[PDB]
Amino acid sequence: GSGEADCGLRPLFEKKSLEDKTERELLESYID
Amino acid sequence: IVEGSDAEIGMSPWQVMLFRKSPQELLCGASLISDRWVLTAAHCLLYPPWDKNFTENDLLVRIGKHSRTRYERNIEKISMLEKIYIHPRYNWRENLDRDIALMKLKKPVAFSDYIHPVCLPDRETAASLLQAGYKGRVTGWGNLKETGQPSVLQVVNLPIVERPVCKDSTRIRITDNMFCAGYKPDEGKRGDACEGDTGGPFVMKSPFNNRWYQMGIVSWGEGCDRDGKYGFYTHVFRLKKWIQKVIDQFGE
Ligand SMILES: [K+]
């Protein structure tokens, strides 16, 4: 809703195709 | 944050610190949702039982930080506030219902590797992600235990809890504008927001578009990280219409 087209994509992670150390935990919780 | 770990650099670039100017003190967490808009909890600004009613001139935000105390040159940005907006139906008398506030920055903040806004949820993202058992992430520089303070931004991931379990966990009346998160007694894992983390973001990463969305604002709890107790969070999507109204009207 903010109208930020680039929102929520972290320059140092998603923009570099790098994952942080704990984000996989979130994904696992959505599936398991 | 109790029972979390050190954030990585740039891991939460929407993270905002809300300060009192004088004396120098960290009040609350907050979040960057655009170049001029910051989201926090209403109780961080207005709580009459403690004679708390901060004006724009009382306060300051710091953006782009990693260390709690150390100055991070040409990375961190300090911003003054133009205007505070508290939700009209914010209820401090009973249960902190509608615990949400927006703060407009005096001048827009430049985005960087360390400064970058979080998304607000649409109806499909809310439907998809705000489900019991699904984990979100809480971040802040608040107390490390219920009693102190970390040198570096802390992070913990916490599961959303089923509403009857939330309701049974507290004698306080809970509303549809709240949800609760945290581990149950028998789940083994631990974690909570604590004093100084309130107002900060509860975020979830969408598997559909790889974006982070702020689903919650750290609102209230009874202690930090007690067995059979849970943190309560303002339900951001439920209050989306108010957020939009404020930005659309006063973002001039
Ligand atoms: K599922």
Which whole-number Å values give the CA distances from B18 to B25, B31, B130, B231, in the listed order? 9, 10, 27, 20
Question: Residue B183 is part of a domain; what is its CATH number?
Answer: 2.40.10.10
Shared-domain flag, residues B74 and B88? yes
Contact (CB, 8 A) for B105 and B36: yes
**Same domain for B242 and B198:** no
B5-42 in b/e form (b: 16+ CB < 10 A) is eebbebbbbbbbbbbeeeeeebbbbbbbbbebbbbbbb
Does residue B164 have a cis bond before it (omega within 30 degrees)?
Answer: no
User: Distance between CA atoms of B184 and B155, rounded to whole angstroms?
Assistant: 19
Task: Count the neighbouring beta carbons within 10 Å of the beta carbon of residue A18.
Answer: 11
Same domain, B7 and B54: no
Task: Mark whether B122 and B158 lie in a shared domain.
Answer: yes
**CA-CA-CA-CA dihedral for B215, B14, B18, B76, to nearest 10:** 170
Residues of A with CB under 8 A from a CB of B: 1-4, 6-14, 20-23, 25-27, 29-30
Q: Which residue of A has its CA nearest to B237?
A: A1
- Confirm or reject contact between B112 and chain A (CB < 8 A): yes
State both tokens at B180: 């609760």
Rounded to the nearest angstrom, the distance between the alpha carbon of B55 and the centre of ligand 1 is 44
Q: Are residues B122 and B231 in the same domain?
A: yes
Contacts of B183 (CB under 8 A, 6+ apart): B158, B159, B189, B190, B191
- Interface contacts (A, B; CB < 8 Å): 89
> With an 8 Å Cβ cutoff, is B155 touching chain A?
yes
Six-digit token string for A10: 């972290």
Residues in CB range of B115: below 8 A, 6 or more apart: B13, B32, B63, B64, B77, B109
**Residues near B58 by Cβ (< 8 Å), separated by ≥ 6?**
B20, B21
A25 to B157: CB separation less than 8 angstroms, yes or no: yes
Q: 3-class secondary structure for chain B?
A: CECCEECCCCCCCCEEEEEECCCCEEEEEEEECCCCEEEECHHHCEEHHHCEECCHHHEEEEECCCECCCCCCCCCEEECEEEEEECCCCECCCCCECCCEEEEECCCCCCCCCCCCCECCCHHHHHHHCCCCCEEEEEECCCCCCCCCCCECEEEEEEECCHHHHHHCCCCCCCCCEEEECCCHHHCCCCECCCCCCCCEEEEECCCCCCEEEEEEEEECCCCCCCCCCEEEEECHHHHHHHHHHHHHHCC
- Do B20 and B124 belong to one domain? no
Distant-in-sequence, close-in-space partners of B74: CB < 8 Å, separation ≥ 6: none
Q: How far apart are CA B197 and CA B142, in angstroms?
A: 5
Co-location of B77 and B137 in the same domain: no
Q: Do B8 and B125 share a domain, yes or no?
A: yes
Beta strand pairing call for B5-6 and B81-86 = unpaired
The CA B178 to ligand 1 mean position distance, Å, reads 22
Q: What is Dmax (Cα atoms) for chain B?
A: 51
Tokens for B209, please give them.
Answer: 């578009």
Using an 8 Å CB-CB cutoff, list chain B residues near A21: 8
B243 touches chain A (CB under 8 A): yes
CATH number at residue A13: 4.10.140.10
Out of B113, B129, B206, closest to residue A12 by CB: B113
Centre of ligand 1 to C-alpha A30, Å, is: 5
Q: Are B45 and B101 in contact (CB under 8 A)?
A: yes
Residue numbers of the domain that contains A1: 1-32
Q: Give how far the C-alpha of residue B96 lies from the chain's centroid of Cα atoms, to the nearest Å.
A: 14
Number of domains in chain B: 2
Which approach determined this entry?
X-ray
Strand B101-105 versus strand B81-86 pairing type: antiparallel
Which residues constitute the domain of residue B166? Answer: 1-12+118-237
CB B24 within 8 A of CB B17: no
Contacts of B104 (CB under 8 A, 6+ apart): B36, B37, B38, B81, B82, B83, B84, B85, B250, B251
Distance CA B45, CA B47 (A): 7
Same domain membership, residue B246 and residue B231: no
The helix (H) or strand (E) run that includes residue A18 is none
3 state DSSP class of A25: helix
- Locate B151 and state its tokens: 């040198």
- Cβ distance B250 to B84 under 8 Å? no
B192 and B112 part of one domain: no
d(CA B157, CA B42): 24
Mutation test of the interface with chain A: which of B205, B211, B245, choosing the one with the most A Cβ atoms within 10 A?
B205
Residues from chain B contacting residue A25 (CB–CB below 8 Å)? 135, 157
**Residue at B150: amino acid letter:** P
B165 CA to middle of ligand 1, Å? Answer: 19
* Whether residues B78 and B29 fall in one domain: yes
Question: Exposed (0-12), middle (13-18) or buried (19+): which is B238, by Cβ within 10 Å?
Answer: middle
Q: Do B157 and A2 touch (CB under 8 A)?
A: no
Is residue B74 a contact partner of residue B215, using CB atoms and an 8 Å limit? Answer: no
Domains contained in chain A, number? 1
Collapse the DSSP code of A15 into the 3-class scheme (helix H, G, I; strand E, B; otherwise coil) and give the result.
helix
SS3 A32: coil
From the list B205, B199, B187, the residue with the least C-alpha distance to B231 is: B199
Angstrom resolution of this structure: 1.7
d(CA B79, CA B34): 13
Helix (H, G, I), strand (E, B) or coil at A14: helix
Count of alpha carbons within 13 angstroms of residue B59, beta-carbon side? 27
Burial of B68: CB neighbours in 10 Å, binned 0-12, 13-18, 19+:
middle
The answer to whether the beta carbons of residues B230 and B222 sit under 8 Å apart is no
Quote the ligand 1 centre to B204 CA distance (angstroms): 14
Contact A13 B207 (CB under 8 A): no
DSSP-derived 3-state class of residue A7: coil
Backbone phi and psi for residue B247, each to the nearest 5 degrees, phi listed first? -65, -45
Domain identity same for B108 and B159:
no
Distance B97 CA to ligand 1 centre (A): 29
